[PDB]
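Build the 3D complex.
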Amino acid sequence: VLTQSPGTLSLSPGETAIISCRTSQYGSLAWYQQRPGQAPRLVIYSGSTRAAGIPDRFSGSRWGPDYTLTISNLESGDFGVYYCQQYEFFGQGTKVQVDIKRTVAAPSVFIFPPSDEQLKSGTASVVCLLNNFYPREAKVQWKVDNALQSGNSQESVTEQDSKDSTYSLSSTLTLSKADYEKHKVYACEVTHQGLRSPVTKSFNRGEC
Amino acid sequence: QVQLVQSGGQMKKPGESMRISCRASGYEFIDCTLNWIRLAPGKRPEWMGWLKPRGGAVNYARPLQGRVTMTRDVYSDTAFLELRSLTVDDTAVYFCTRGKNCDYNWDFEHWGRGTPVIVSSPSTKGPSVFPLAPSSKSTSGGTAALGCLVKDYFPEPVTVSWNSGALTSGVHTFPAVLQSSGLYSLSSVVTVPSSSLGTQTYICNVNHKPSNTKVDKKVEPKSC
Amino acid sequence: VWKNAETTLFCASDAKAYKTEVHNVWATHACVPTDPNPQEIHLENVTEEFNVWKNNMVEQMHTDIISLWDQSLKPCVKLTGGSAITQACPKVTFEPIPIHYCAPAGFAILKCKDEEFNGTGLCKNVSTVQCTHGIKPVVSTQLLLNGSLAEKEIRIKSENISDNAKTIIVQLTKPVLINCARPSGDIRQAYCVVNRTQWNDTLGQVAIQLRKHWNTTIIFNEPSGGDLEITTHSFNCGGEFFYCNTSDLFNSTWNDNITLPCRIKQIINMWQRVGQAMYAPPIQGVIRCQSNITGILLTRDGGNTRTNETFRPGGGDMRDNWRSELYKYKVVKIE
Ligand SMILES: *[C@@H]1O[C@H](CO)[C@@H](O)[C@H](O)[C@H]1NC(C)=O
Ligand SMILES: *[C@@H]1O[C@H](CO)[C@@H](O)[C@H](O)[C@H]1NC(C)=O
Ligand SMILES: *[C@@H]1O[C@H](CO)[C@@H](O)[C@H](O)[C@H]1NC(C)=O
Ligand SMILES: *[C@@H]1O[C@H](CO)[C@@H](O)[C@H](O)[C@H]1NC(C)=O
Ligand SMILES: *[C@@H]1O[C@H](CO)[C@@H](O)[C@H](O)[C@H]1NC(C)=O
Ligand SMILES: *[C@@H]1O[C@H](CO)[C@@H](O)[C@H](O)[C@H]1NC(C)=O
Ligand SMILES: *[C@@H]1O[C@H](CO)[C@@H](O)[C@H](O)[C@H]1NC(C)=O
Ligand SMILES: *[C@@H]1O[C@H](CO)[C@@H](O)[C@H](O)[C@H]1NC(C)=O
Ligand SMILES: *[C@@H]1O[C@H](CO)[C@@H](O)[C@H](O)[C@H]1NC(C)=O
Ligand SMILES: *[C@@H]1O[C@H](CO)[C@@H](O)[C@H](O)[C@H]1NC(C)=O
Ligand SMILES: *[C@@H]1O[C@H](CO)[C@@H](O)[C@H](O)[C@H]1NC(C)=O
Ligand SMILES: *[C@@H]1O[C@H](CO)[C@@H](O)[C@H](O)[C@H]1NC(C)=O
Ligand code: NA
Ligand code: NA
Ligand code: NA
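Done.
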């Protein structure tokens, strides 16, 4: 019904956060802010109408089905989860989190096939590791026999490193042992600003 | 000054039912619609229903019809929410909200502090720990990656150190993730000199205290 | 030329001064005699904005009819918060009569003639009158009674049909007769009886209209909660307050007599305002009153678990009752 994006923004105070919502439905749309350990706060309603006590820095807009919340001169108070809302429906939320500006770092990519131990219990987990990259924006696609996957993968990211200010990320393709036996080529395609070209790490089943 | 005040947080167990309250101040109680919203980290906020204190009319979110009940004490300007047959998936912070003006319900300018409810299970389950082994080809020029897949445990959390604390530099332990199974999954990796693989033992130490479980998995390469 | 104006209206009715019935008594002193020959002039090439949901006439009718009830009904006890007033409990004669609402010197009332008017928007066909039609100030829940009918087909009205918190007002084109009485045994059990085929047919044609807004399987269902005044079809028959279970009216999916059980209650929640009142036990003898059902008040379920949409009989804010009857009208000052 209401699809919000991106999932996470990584910014510093002074920068601009652009959050979006896609809706096919008719209905006044509103934006809420939620700071850590506090009740959500109405920020925009009726698409672009600033709520009381809300600075000009906060600005809503609409282009066809796409609504946008723009926060201009970011301040520590502004960080948290933002949600769009239309009648009784909400977006998944966009997390805008404090980030430390650093030189671009390309991820080194590693893929790990299912351990034999596991396959002996009817489930196959393929794992892709993107290590020590920056900025956080990164894209990981799974391909099985070259076909795009959907739904059967989960991701997980570490916080910014206190030492090198890099992010690390894991993607895990969970398949039944059945499906795992049907296909030969497993691969994760990674894209990131620090990569001249998209990188692919792959392997053939039963063939290290 | 429209102010909504909610009851204190609660701890519950699967099967139990909960009742929270919400007292409205600074306006005509019967003249404005009321709402119950719950928020849980990582979950889409969920509207549970609205209550019109006038005659106590209601409208429950379809996925909740049967389980939820919303009432009110018109002499005490207090709204009540009851949710029964609690599962772990009912863990959230519950809020009551009102519109900015009575002519429109959905622009929630007013929220209570929110009542946090935690639903804890007596059930536990230790993780299966699978090696994520370096293979490919020395992994790279000189850097190798390896880890453990700590799968299907519950509830949270799990500890994972390497060689019992000896190895910390280069270690990344990822946020646990919930699966459709209802069980959690977690990965932990480390980078190391690809040359040392043949001579350096790597062990990961997984502790799931809820099931008092200790697993030490040696992750060795792929000597084909 | 004129501008949209807000002013006080006056009421007119054909009440009898010798009659002891409460609606008559009130209209005798709070209203003026009706003009037997109401004027209505059509206006050419004219167009006007109407919006019943922002129409001050509704608020005015509501306040009058709160006034009529407060001055007419005589509860033995009147509870509000703490400490309740006791009074004499004389039985009362109760049957609403038509009130008309009229514009005073300087103003006028515009009537929307557009066949397919929804309550909000531009009217192209607009005439001018000095008094609304005669409206029976019937207070009831779930079913609108003794009201006016849609001309050609059932009409659906809402302040915002997509807003699940906005009551949906349904207006019938053909009235369904409902007949309630307590035979002359438990002296509080009554029964209402509507023709099953006639009612089932009606519900199907409402389904047809509800699609258009939602092209799916339409479900009618019982109310999900609330005071008994809301969860039952509640209405006053000859001084006694009826509460009738409508389970058999609203329980069907779209893609012999019906016999509704009622209780007569001595203890009711006031609709005028927050409070409860207590009344004497039922007058003996045959208590009857049959009515035309001319409309229904509905609420759609929120959430998204399409396939289907579910509707339950609503009400409680009597302003919806007045709205179903005053939506064609609008007041204006004459500059
Ligand atoms: C009203 O205007 C229309 C054209 O818009 C015209 O056809 C009609 O004759 C007009 N009525 C008069 C003459 O007042
Ligand atoms: C009339 O009512 C419908 C709903 O029945 C609404 O969608 C529409 O906006 C209204 N038509 C107008 C504004 O002329
Ligand atoms: C106005 O409506 C009436 C019926 O309600 C109709 O007889 C007449 O032709 C209409 N006039 C216009 C403006 O079309
Ligand atoms: C019921 O309906 C008929 C029209 O079919 C009408 O003439 C009659 O007066 C109505 N009765 C009441 C009580 O309004
Ligand atoms: C219904 O809501 C819309 C906004 O979603 C508003 O523009 C419109 O005025 C409302 N309907 C009316 C005219 O009462
Ligand atoms: C009501 O009408 C529908 C068709 O319009 C029919 O399927 C159903 O049998 C009818 N119900 C009764 C009880 O007559
Ligand atoms: C509604 O949808 C049904 C099939 O889903 C179709 O038969 C019908 O034409 C639709 N009605 C309209 C006019 O949109
Ligand atoms: C109405 O009667 C039905 C049984 O037909 C019952 O399930 C429901 O609880 C009753 N509700 C009221 C308002 O009395
Ligand atoms: C509800 O409706 C179904 C048919 O639509 C019927 O089988 C059932 O008996 C009804 N339930 C009640 C409360 O009578
Ligand atoms: C209900 O009305 C229909 C005519 O519309 C008629 O055939 C039937 O006899 C009526 N049912 C009863 C039991 O009166
Ligand atoms: C509807 O009108 C009839 C005829 O006057 C009357 O007997 C009956 O009481 C009315 N219904 C209600 C609920 O007032
Ligand atoms: C709509 O959902 C109900 C359950 O709430 C189900 O029984 C019914 O079959 C559904 N309607 C259709 C036509 O899919
Ligand atoms: Na909205
Ligand atoms: Na009389
Ligand atoms: Na009295």
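The pocket of 2-acetamido-2-deoxy-beta-D-glucopyranose (ligand 5) is lined by residues A 28; C 51, 53, 120, 159-160 (CB under 6 Å).
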